[PDB]
């Protein structure tokens, strides 16, 4: 275990004031630090905490080359799409995870943070796309989608749609329509010296 004194900046990932839209998710790279996971898998503040390829209770003694934290906001019902092998509007057009994904998906209800009475339409997702995304691919184009046989030429109209839609987030929504803050921790080990190790 290399002699690393810096601790991994998980705090500023989970306790951020602003999260990115799912169509434009934000990736933060974690490296050259000691990763203490005992503050995450023992936290009751999370509604979802699933790990793939690794047990979260045996994650605190392993060394990785990199850890990537992908953060975004989606509605409750769509949280199930943040998993390997899944399909749907989010899984296919916004945020795709590979079938061999290794890491942990953490999510919590943020109804009292990301909603307002008048409706918080700041968060958006992609509804229309010509094809599905590759694993960890990001697409933030705002070009007009041609649904019909005729050219749109950047003009909205019949069979010409703007690809991004907003979430109608309101404090009075049912749980499935309440906002959830999602952080996906993607782990990798390469044929290289590790830079992220547990507290030992």
């Amino acid at each position, epitope marked *: 275990f290399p002699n690393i*004194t*810096n*601790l991994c*900046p998980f*705090g*500023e990932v989970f*306790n*951020a*004031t*602003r999260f990115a839209s799912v169509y434009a998710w934000n990736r*933060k790279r974690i490296s050259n630090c000691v990763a203490d996971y005992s503050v995450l898998y023992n936290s009751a503040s999370f509604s979802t905490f699933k790990c793939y390829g690794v047990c979260p209770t045996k994650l605190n003694d392993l060394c990785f080359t990199n850890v990537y934290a992908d953060s975004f906001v989606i509605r409750g019902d769509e949280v199930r799409q943040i998993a390997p092998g899944q399909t749907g509007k989010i899984a296919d057009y916004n945020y795709k995870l590979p079938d061999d994904f290794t890491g942990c998906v953490i999510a919590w209800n943020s109804n*009292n*943070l990301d909603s*307002k009475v008048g409706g918080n339409y700041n968060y958006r997702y992609r509804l229309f796309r010509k094809s599905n995304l590759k694993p960890f691919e990001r697409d933030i184009s705002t070009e007009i989608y041609q649904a019909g046989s005729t050219p749109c030429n950047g003009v909205q109209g019949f069979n010409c749609y703007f690809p991004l839609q907003s979430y109608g987030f309101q404090p009075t929504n049912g749980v499935g329509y309440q906002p959830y803050r999602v952080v996906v921790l993607s782990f990798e080990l390469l044929h290289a010296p590790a830079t992220v190790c547990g507290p030992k």
Partner: antibody
Amino acid sequence: QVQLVQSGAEVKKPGASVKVSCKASGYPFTSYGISWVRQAPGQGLEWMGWISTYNGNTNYAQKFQGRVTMTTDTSTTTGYMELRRLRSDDTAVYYCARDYTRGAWFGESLIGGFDNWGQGTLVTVSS
Amino acid sequence: IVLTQSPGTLSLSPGERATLSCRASQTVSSTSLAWYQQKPGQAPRLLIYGASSRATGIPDRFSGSGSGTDFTLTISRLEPEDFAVYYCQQHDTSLTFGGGTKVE
């Protein structure tokens, strides 16, 4: 227990400069930034600036830009704040506080506040 | 985002409930506002962060909430030690403090 301590009171002439230290312990130093807040006698709190103990990035209040320089020593876990060109109206207590309003590594806004404050260093400016 | 507080001085007896207001000239994110308490001769301490979340070590009698441009600090009952100057802070834009309210 997290503790922040500072230097004793100082007396300066107008046009002089003061460098106030801030020794911190009881936590991972490079996980939290440091903020400085000034309070003149009988007045409220005025934000001076913020520094990252990890990468040295700073964020200064406009009123103090060009006057205040902040540095950090991570080997002695001590912060410093230097205020140049002291004026007669800079007489105040200067507080050092641990920061959780901006990330130390990525520089993004956090849900929090200046959790742990120091004792306050009194600086008097007079001819 | 200029913050103002009211009343300047809040005169209440021990055992009474105290309401302290903070208003913003612009909308302030509900997660970017905090309240501080400063006792005479002492440095300020954090009471509430994220508008409504109680800081560690703070008694349960201290609570608060708010949104938009109107935030409130609530003290369910004033103890002998709750007579101090309170400040509101926001860091949605830069970082600013309100004028401060004295409880007497």
